[PDB]
Structures are given as C-alpha cells and as structure tokens.
Design an enzyme around this catalytic site. Structure first.
Site: not given
Length: 130
Positions: A15, A29, A34-35, A37, A76
């Site tokens: 991401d 970002r 939402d990828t 972790e 970001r």
C-alpha cells in the site's frame, strides 16, 4: 480530479510507494486500500510483490489526489496511483490482495469502484478471500 505525472523511485510495500513528485521524493499511501502487513500477515508479501511489479513495469506512473486531505499524519501523500493508466489501488482490490478501507477525510471519489472490484474478488474467493 486530475492525474499528475510522477516517477517511481522505490517500492516499499503493498500500500505504499516512494515517488518523485513535482521534482521531490515523496512517499505515497494508496487511498482506500488496506493490504496485509509485511512489517507478516498472510498475503502480505504477495500484495507487496504485486504493487512492486505493477509500478516497476509501468512506462508512466501518475498520481491522482482526491478531493479531501492530501497527506496523512506521517507526511505521506494520499492518492490513487496509476501505472500506464491502470489504477493500482483498484488492481490490488480486484486481485483480492487488499480490502477496501474506511473512507478517510472526504477522500471517497473511487470508493464504489473499489467496492465493486472487491465484491468480485470475494465472489471468486481470490487470495485474501480464499
């Protein structure tokens, strides 16, 4: 919204990507995704490889800021990233390598589009949806 040119500097993960924007390096970002972790969650490294490969093979990278806040608290840039006209945010969700995230500060222009890509990935029980 408008697309602005950028230059890939370095992949970071699923991401996040480091880009040269307006002549200066900046970490972006990806909006609304939402990828998993990596720094590890299942598919975390798959998501990272996907984003890395898509931006790397791209001839042209573009940054598209949404209508809400443009930077998060960590400095970001918050945007939709395009690799040769294809949206990486959407590609990720469609490949089932990321979930659609909660809207953040009015940045929701492409929420439904990603919403659909996600339904489809789930329907195909693709990766994260396996």
């Amino acid at each position: 919204l408008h697309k602005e040119p950028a230059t890939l500097i370095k992949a970071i993960d699923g991401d996040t990507v480091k880009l040269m924007y307006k002549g200066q390096p900046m970490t972006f970002r990806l909006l609304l995704v939402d990828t998993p972790e990596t720094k590890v969650e299942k598919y975390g490294p798959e998501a990272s490889a996907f984003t890395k490969k898509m931006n790397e093979n791209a001839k042209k990278i573009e940054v598209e800021f949404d209508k809400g806040q443009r930077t998060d608290k960590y400095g970001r840039g918050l945007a939709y990233i395009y690799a040769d006209g294809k949206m990486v945010n959407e590609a990720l969700v469609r490949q089932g390598l990321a979930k659609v995230a909660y809207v953040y500060k009015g940045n929701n222009t492409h929420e439904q589009l990603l919403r659909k890509a996600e339904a489809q990935a789930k329907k195909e029980k693709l990766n994260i949806w396996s």
